[PDB]
Design a binder for this molecule. Structure first.
Ligand SMILES: C[C@@H](CCC(=O)O)C(=O)O
Ligand SMILES: C[C@@H](CCC(=O)O)C(=O)O
Lengths: 291, 291
């Protein structure tokens, strides 16, 4: 299998290296020379343009920053692709954008999946990413051997756009939980309840969630959590702010009522203006900006 | 060891609690000013008395299960002088941290040992003797109390000094309320995006957003057939009771000057929903997010 990998950034570069490492022929394009060089150093044949990268490919993977860039990449490359090429978009983009590019691809006789990922650079490098997939089950079956060497988990979420929708809905919940957990630890401290004691209660009770059992925003109860390491990501505020922007687009596009998610979105947008580089659990320290 | 216990408050939690004490071979002296509650308790072996002070006069331990801080205060005022010195008072009511510490001090000024030990698990937990007790006060007092708590309890956790039981409970329940709303928002958003309830369930429960509000209390019928959504939102944990705890959380916020943006937002949402739907499981808040 020959794979064209379009976007060789902080996620794309290690993903593509795992593909090389699993026996695929990987062709590549990135507009940053430092990204393209890094990738050629691990065996990707890099080309000057995306249409050239796509020319001989059975599978085309995108890992790009916005729906607008993904769309312009599709219209740039679709005529260069061979028929029945399989397109996998692993970018995190809106549901609307996902569905538009899916339809554009299939109109050219291609097969297309949305497959955005969770796990970050660390997951990408360790080949433990979780892919949330939208599209036809038979297209996913065909893609499975390409995805497997990048992935710890591959979940079929439904028809085109479902992958994007599942990730966005999970991350909106996550954001709300990280804030609620933070509020809880600060309230407890002002009530004279120790952090270990609250941790022991909540983790054994109905309030338990990853935001506390793994991402505990106070130092001590979970020695590996970002709070014990100057809030080094982990999952940056910048990235969480990005996901919540997409959740707010989805909310606006559907007319949905999402009071806590929208509140969380405003909290993180404001926090990202100052602390975009910190793990999102660092929000515990911005609560008095609220009043 | 077998002990004489006065049980003040024989309502839908106190009655089954008192029944389990009788089953464990304790002599239980009960009082409740609602004769119907008292009659039900007598049927399961509680010796019912004409007045609270009479019930406490010959008791080694006095348990209160009462609706509010004010009723606890009034009860302690009415009975502390009647109890034998160094009687152990356990308050398993859910009341404000401020109120807890006030009644704790009151009990101690009368020569009585006192713990706060509010419970979670509701009436079914009460009947099954699987309640979680979250305890505030001295280690040695809790050591004294353990034989009495065990026949009612699935978990006993020592949370810290007087008031810490109440604090731990109210922090966990605030988090729960926020999570239950956030889960509802996600499921509605999914429905509007065309993502199925089952698919969203599968994702969130396998990802970082997983929590009891989805995995046990799923607010759409289907994915968790035992959840209240499948039974006309019969509680479960009523909106009335969540609204009361949320009130207690807002009291704790106001007493400390803490900042709890989502917890306060969740309190406002539940206070509105409680005006007409006090009787429904708190998962039913999902109704407010749909047209
Ligand atoms: C466990 C994983 C297989 C992919 C792999 O080999 O990394 C999956 O089933 O998604
Ligand atoms: C919860 C208590 C045991 C009492 C029970 O099984 O009812 C304990 O294990 O501390």
């Amino acid at each position: 299998t020959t794979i064209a990998f379009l976007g060789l950034g902080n996620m794309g570069a290690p993903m593509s290296a795992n593909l090389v490492g699993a026996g695929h022929v990987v062709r590549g394009f990135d507009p940053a020379p430092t990204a393209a060089s890094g990738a050629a150093a691990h065996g990707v044949a890099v080309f000057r343009s995306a249409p050239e990268a796509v020319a001989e490919a059975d599978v085309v993977i995108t890992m790009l920053p916005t729906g607008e860039v993904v769309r312009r990449c599709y219209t740039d490359v679709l005529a260069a692709a061979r028929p029945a090429t399989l397109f996998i978009d692993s970018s995190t983009i809106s549901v609307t954008d996902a569905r538009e590019v899916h339809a554009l691809a299939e109109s050219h006789g291609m097969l297309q999946l949305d497959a955005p990922v969770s796990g970050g650079v660390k997951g990408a490098a360790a080949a433990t990413l979780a892919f949330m997939v939208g599209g036809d089950e038979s297209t996913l079956r065909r893609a499975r051997p390409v995805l497997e060497p990048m992935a710890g988990k591959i979940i079929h979420c439904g028809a085109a756009g479902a992958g994007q929708a599942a990730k966005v809905c999970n991350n909106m919940v996550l954001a709300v939980q990280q804030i609620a957990i933070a509020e809880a630890f600060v309230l407890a401290e002002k009530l004279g309840l120790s952090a270990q004691s609250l941790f022991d209660v909540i983790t054994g009770a109905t309030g338990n969630c990853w935001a506390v059992h793994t991402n505990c925003p106070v130092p001590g109860p979970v020695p590996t959590s970002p709070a014990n390491n100057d809030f080094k990501p982990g999952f940056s505020t910048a990235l969480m702010n990005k996901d919540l922007g997409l959740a707010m687009d989805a909310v606006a596009a559907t007319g949905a009522t999402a009071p806590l998610g929208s509140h969380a979105a405003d909290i993180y947008a404001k926090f990202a203006a100052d602390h975009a580089d910190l793990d999102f659990s660092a929000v515990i320290h911005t609560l008095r900006a609220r009043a």
